[PDB]
Design a protein around this ligand. Structure first.
Ligand SMILES: [Mn+2]
Ligand SMILES: [Mn+2]
Ligand SMILES: [Mn+2]
Ligand SMILES: [Mn+2]
Ligand SMILES: [Mn+2]
Ligand SMILES: [Mn+2]
Ligand SMILES: [N+]
Ligand SMILES: [N+]
Ligand SMILES: [Zn+2]
Ligand SMILES: [Zn+2]
Lengths: 184, 368, 368, 184
DNA sequence: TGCGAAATTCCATGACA
DNA sequence: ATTGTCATGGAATTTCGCA
DNA sequence: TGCGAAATTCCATGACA
DNA sequence: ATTGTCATGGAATTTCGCA
C-alpha cells in the first residue's frame, strides 16, 4: 500500500445549531485526514445546498479523492451525490450510529468542539469574526504523535503564526458559571 | 563687449577670435568674413538677448536654435551660449521629452517561502455580473498560487473581507501592493498591524513593480475571455473555475504548477502527477524543499546603448501623473537625495517633500 | 487503436513504438515502462479526446498541455497531436497574443514637389477656446509646410470650409488621410473629384501611415503647451503664431525650414537667411530645385530577429478594432489575397469582404 | 542693388463696395511685387480692423518687408501703423491722387478688376464662393514679360491647375445688356 | 561514434497594468 | 520608504533510437 | 602631417496618433 | 485599394586653427 497523502481524504461534519452570528447558525468542518488540516465554513443550515456552496469554495483550492461523513441528510441526498460524481470525488459513509474516522481526526474534532465552546462563551454571538483565528490556532497546534503541525505537513514550511502558548482549552470558574447562566 | 571688440578692429589678437580672418566695421557694427559669408559679431553684452530671441521663436533645441543665429551672427563658441539658455528655459525643461532610456530592469529574488510575500491588486471594472464589478487578485510570490475574490468596488472594506477569508489558511509576512486608495488607507494599515503583516508599496504609477500580479491578471482575463466566447459575459460563476484552472497549470520554464509549488503534491484534479506515489509525505516535503530552491531565476538584461543611471545630487524630473490637455508632462527639476537601488530613488521634490520614485518616471534634466 | 496496440503486446514491432522498451497489459490498459515512469498508452482512437481534455483545463499552449498529458500517458509524437488541436481551437486562436513581430517599416519616397501630396488630420478635442475644440492640420509632404485651422468639430463641412481657403493658393494632386468620418464621407469625395484631387486613405487603425502629419501634431501640441505654461489654455489666438513659428523652424537633419523648402527664400521674419541675396530669383529657383532633390532620405531599418512577412494564401488574423471587455482581441482567420507591399495586404475577411490592411494589425495564424 | 525677390513688397488695396455676398462687401487685394502673386480677402468694411484681421491670416504664411498702399483711411490710421511696426514691416504710401505701383502690379490690378466684373455679372451675389477659383486663375496666368506665371515664380514648379485656355476677359453681348439691367 | 528524427530548451514578443 | 513577469510557438540545440 | 578643441554629424529615444 | 516621422541632446566623428 502507498503512503498516506494530503487530499487523500477529507472528513466533513456539521456542528450546531449555534447562537446566531451575523445570520449564521452552523459550521461545516473539513479536516484533511493525512495532515489534520482544518477548514471551517459558516452556514445557515445543515443542508445539501449549504454544503455544496461551502465545498465549492474549498474545492476551488484543492479537491479530495474521497469525502468521509456520517449519514446526515445533507450528505446522503442525491444532489450531494451528483455533485461529487461530477468532480470525481468518491463518497464514504460511516455506518449509522457508529461514527468512525481516525485517531488523528477524532482528536481534532474534539479540539474543534472544545475550542469553539471556550470562546463561544462571554461572546456567544461574535463567533463569525473569530473563525479565521480559530483555524490558525488549530492548524498551528503541535501534534504529539507527529513532530509537526498541520500547517507544516500541508505546506512543508514553518508558519508566520506559531501558537507557542499551547493553551488551557478547559473552562475557567467564571466561564462555567456564565455558561450555566446563558443556558438558563 | 565694446571693450573686447575694439582691440580686435585694430588687428591685435583676442583668445577665441581666430587671427587668420579679417574683422572690420560697417553700418555701425563689427563684422567678420567667414567661409559661409559675412556675419555680425555682437558685443558679449548683447549675446544672451540674441540666443534668447532665436530660441523663443519656436522653443527649439541646440542645432535648430543655432541655425537661426548663424544666419546673422558669429561669435566664439556659440553653442556654449545656446546650451546655457536651454538649461535655464523652464518651458523647454518641463515640456520636452527625454531621449535617454532607463537603466536595465532588476529581477528581484523570488520569495523563499510560500506566505513570505503576497502581491495584491484589483482587476476591473468588468461588465456587471451578479452585481459584481471587480476581482481582488492575491498572488503568492514564491509559488504563483493565486486567490480570486469578486467585489462590488475596489475598497478597503472589500479587501479586508476577502483577506480575512484568505488569512484563515495562513498569514503572510508581507503584502505588496500599488498605491491604490484601497491599500493606502489607515483602516487597511490597522488591519495589517493588527496581524503582524508588513505593508510594502510600489513606487507610484509603476505597475511593473507589482509585475507578479499584473502578469497574473493577464492570464485571468485571457482564460475568462476564452470561456466566454459567444456567450454573455457572466464571469462571476467562473472565478472559482479560473482560480482552480490557473493554480494547476504548468509554467513551461519551471516545469511545475503553482499548486505543486505550494503543496508538493497534486490534488484530485485531471492529469494529476503521480511521480511521488511511493514516497512518504516527509520524503515528498524534502524533495519539495529541494525543488523550491533550484527554480530558474532570470538575470538582469543588458543596458540599452543610451541609458542613464541616477547619481546622488543629480537634477532629475518626475513625470506628471495625469497631465491635463496642453500641459507639461514633466515636473520642475528636483534633486536625487538617495539611490535606493539603480532603479529606485528618493528625490526632494523641491516643495520640498521626500518622494520614493522609479527611474521610469524620471528624466535626467538636460544641459546639466 | 485496439488493432495496432495488440501486435505490440505480443512483442512484434510497430513504427513509432521503440522496440527496446517493454509493453504490457495491466488493469485493462496497455502500458509501457519509460525512464520517467510507467505511462498508459491509449488507443489511437482515444487520443484526440485526451489532448482536448488536457488543453481545455486552462486552454494552454504546446508545452503546458503536453506536461499535463505526459503525467498519465505516452504515445508516439504526442506534440504533433497537441499542435493539431491548438491549430483548431477557435477560442485560443482568437484570444492568444502573437509572438512574431511585424517586418521592418517602409520609408516611402518624399513627394517630389510641393503640392504633390497633402497629409491631413484632426487634433482634439482641446479645452474650449472661443467655442473651438479642434484643429485641422494640413501638411505638405515634400516641404513639411503646414496650415492650421481651428474648428468646432472634426466634420466634413469644416474640412471643406478650411480647404477651400487653403486651395485658394494651390490645388494638390493628392490628399492623404486616415479613415476618419470627416474624410470618407461622400460629400468630401465629391468635393475632391470636383477639383481633380485624388483621395488616398491610410489602412484602418494605423496612424503610422499618416506619420507625416501625426508627427507634426506632436510639434504643434508641444509648442502650444510651452506658450501656455502658467496661463489659461487660450489656444485659439496662438494657432497663427504656432503655424508661422513651425513653418520657419529648421529641421537639423535637413538644414532647411519648411518655408525655405516651399519658397527657396525666407520672408520678413526673425533671423532670415541671406545667402541668396545676390542671386536673381531664377538663380535662386534653380538652387532650390537642386536643394529639393538632394534631401536626406531614411532607409528601411533591419528586420527584428523574429518577424514575419505576409505570403499570398497565408492564414492571418486581423486585430479587433475596439474590443469589448473580456472579448477576443482577434478576428477569425482569413486569407491573404494580395501582397500590395511587404507591409500592406488585401485579405478576404471570410464574410467575405476584401479589406486592405496593415500587417501591424495582423498576426499570422499559429500551428499552420 | 540686389535683385528683386518675393516678399520684398506687398501691394494692397480695397475694391468695393460690392453687392452683398454671404455678408461681405469688399475685397482686400494683395499682390506680391516681384512674382505678381495675388491673395484676396473678403471683408465687411474698408477699415483698419478688417485690414488687420485679413493681414493676420496672410502674415501667418509670409511676412513682407514693405507694404505699399494708397492713402486710404484703413492704411494711414495709427492702429495700422502700430500693427506694422510690431511686425518689422515698413509702410509705404503713394502720394494722394497719384497712384504709383509698378507696370506688373498695375496690369495685375486691371486683370483683377476686370475678371471680377466678368463673373460678378449674372451672379452679383455669389462671389464669395468664387474667390478661390479667381485667385487660381490669376496666379496660373502666363506673364508676357516673364516666361513664367506667379505660381511658378513663387514656388519654383509647374502647378496642377494650369489655365491653358487664356480667356476672353471682355464682356459678351448678353452680359453688357444685363449689367445695364442690374445697374438700373 | 555517427545519423535522422524527436524532444527539449531557448527566447523574442506582447500584455498585464 | 524599494525592485517587472511569464505564456507562447517557431527555431536552435540536445537527446534518443538504432546500428 | 599632427595636436587639442570646436563644429558637425550621428542616432536612440519617444511621442504623434 | 497602399507605405511612419523627426526634434532632441549626448557621443562619435570630422574639421578647424595653428604650427
Ligand atoms: Mn454529523
Ligand atoms: Mn492596480
Ligand atoms: Mn486622426
Ligand atoms: Mn484704394
Ligand atoms: Mn493593475
Ligand atoms: Mn491623429
Ligand atoms: N532582491
Ligand atoms: N514609394
Ligand atoms: Zn524654450
Ligand atoms: Zn484553447
Amino acid at each position: 500500500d502507498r503512503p498516506q497523502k494530503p487530499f487523500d481524504k477529507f472528513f466533513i461534519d456539521y456542528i450546531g445549531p449555534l447562537p446566531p452570528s451575523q445570520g449564521y447558525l452552523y459550521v461545516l468542518v473539513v479536516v484533511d485526514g493525512m495532515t489534520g488540516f482544518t477548514w471551517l465554513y459558516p452556514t445557515k443550515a445543515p443542508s445539501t445546498s449549504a454544503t455544496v456552496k461551502s465545498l465549492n469554495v474549498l474545492t476551488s483550492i484543492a479537491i479530495p479523492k474521497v469525502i468521509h461523513s456520517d449519514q446526515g441528510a445533507a450528505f446522503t441526498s442525491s444532489t450531494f451525490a451528483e455533485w461529487a460524481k461530477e468532480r470525481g470525488i468518491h463518497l464514504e459513509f460511516s455506518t449509522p450510529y457508529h461514527p468512525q474516522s481516525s485517531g488523528k481526526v477524532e482528536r481534532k474534532n474534539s479540539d474543534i468542539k472544545r475550542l469553539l465552546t471556550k470562546l463561544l462563551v462571554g461572546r456567544p454571538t461574535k463567533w463569525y469574526d473569530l473563525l479565521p483565528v480559530v483555524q490558525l490556532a488549530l492548524n498551528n497546534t503541535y501534534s504529539p504523535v507527529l513532530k509537526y503541525t498541520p500547517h507544516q505537513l500541508l505546506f512543508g514550511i514553518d508558519s508566520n503564526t506559531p501558537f507557542a502558548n499551547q493553551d488551557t482549552l478547559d473552562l475557567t470558574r467564571e466561564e462555567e458559571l456564565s455558561l450555566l447562566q446563558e443556558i438558563r | 563687449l565694446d571693450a573686447e571688440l575694439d582691440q580686435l578692429l585694430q588687428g591685435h589678437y583676442i583668445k577665441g577670435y581666430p587671427k587668420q580672418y579679417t574683422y572690420f566695421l560697417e553700418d555701425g557694427k563689427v563684422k567678420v568674413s567667414r567661409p559661409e559669408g559675412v556675419k555680425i559679431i555682437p558685443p558679449q553684452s548683447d549675446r544672451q538677448k540674441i540666443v534668447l530671441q532665436a530660441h523663443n521663436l519656436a522653443h527649439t533645441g541646440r542645432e535648430a536654435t543655432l541655425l537661426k543665429i548663424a544666419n546673422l551672427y558669429w561669435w566664439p563658441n556659440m553653442r556654449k551660449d545656446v546650451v546655457k539658455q536651454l538649461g535655464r528655459c523652464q518651458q523647454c525643461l518641463i515640456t520636452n521629452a527625454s531621449n535617454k532610456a532607463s537603466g536595465p530592469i532588476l529581477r528581484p529574488d523570488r520569495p523563499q517561502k510560500p506566505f513570505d510575500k503576497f502581491f495584491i491588486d484589483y482587476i476591473g471594472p468588468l461588465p456587471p455580473s451578479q452585481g459584481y464589478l471587480y476581482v481582488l487578485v492575491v498572488v503568492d510570490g514564491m509559488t504563483g498560487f493565486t486567490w480570486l475574490y469578486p467585489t462590488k468596488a475596489p475598497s478597503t472594506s472589500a479587501t479586508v473581507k476577502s483577506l480575512n477569508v484568505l488569512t484563515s489558511i495562513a498569514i503572510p509576512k508581507v503584502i505588496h501592493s500599488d498605491q491604490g486608495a484601497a491599500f493606502t488607507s489607515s483602516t487597511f494599515a490597522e488591519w495589517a498591524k493588527e496581524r503582524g503583516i508588513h505593508l510594502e508599496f510600489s513606487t507610484p504609477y509603476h505597475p511593473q513593480s507589482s509585475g507578479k500580479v499584473e502578469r497574473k491578471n493577464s492570464d485571468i482575463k485571457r482564460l475568462l475571455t476564452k470561456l466566454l466566447v459567444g456567450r454573455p459575459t457572466k464571469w462571476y460563476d467562473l472565478l472559482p473555475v479560473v482560480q482552480l484552472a490557473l493554480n494547476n497549470t504548468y509554467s513551461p520554464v519551471l516545469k511545475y504548477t503553482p499548486h505543486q509549488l505550494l503543496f508538493g503534491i497534486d490534488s484530485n484534479t485531471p492529469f494529476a502527477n503521480q511521480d511521488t506515489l511511493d514516497l512518504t509525505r516527509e520524503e515528498e516535503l524534502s524533495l519539495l524543499q529541494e525543488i523550491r530552491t533550484s527554480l530558474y531565476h532570470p538575470s538582469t538584461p543588458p543596458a540599452s546603448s543610451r541609458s542613464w543611471s541616477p547619481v546622488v545630487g543629480q537634477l532629475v524630473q518626475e513625470r506628471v501623473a495625469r497631465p491635463a490637455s496642453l500641459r507639461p508632462r514633466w515636473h520642475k527639476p528636483s534633486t536625487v537625495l538617495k539611490v535606493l537601488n539603480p532603479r529606485t530613488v528618493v528625490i526632494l521634490d523641491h516643495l520640498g517633500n521626500n518622494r520614493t520614485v522609479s527611474i521610469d518616471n524620471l528624466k535626467p534634466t538636460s544641459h546639466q
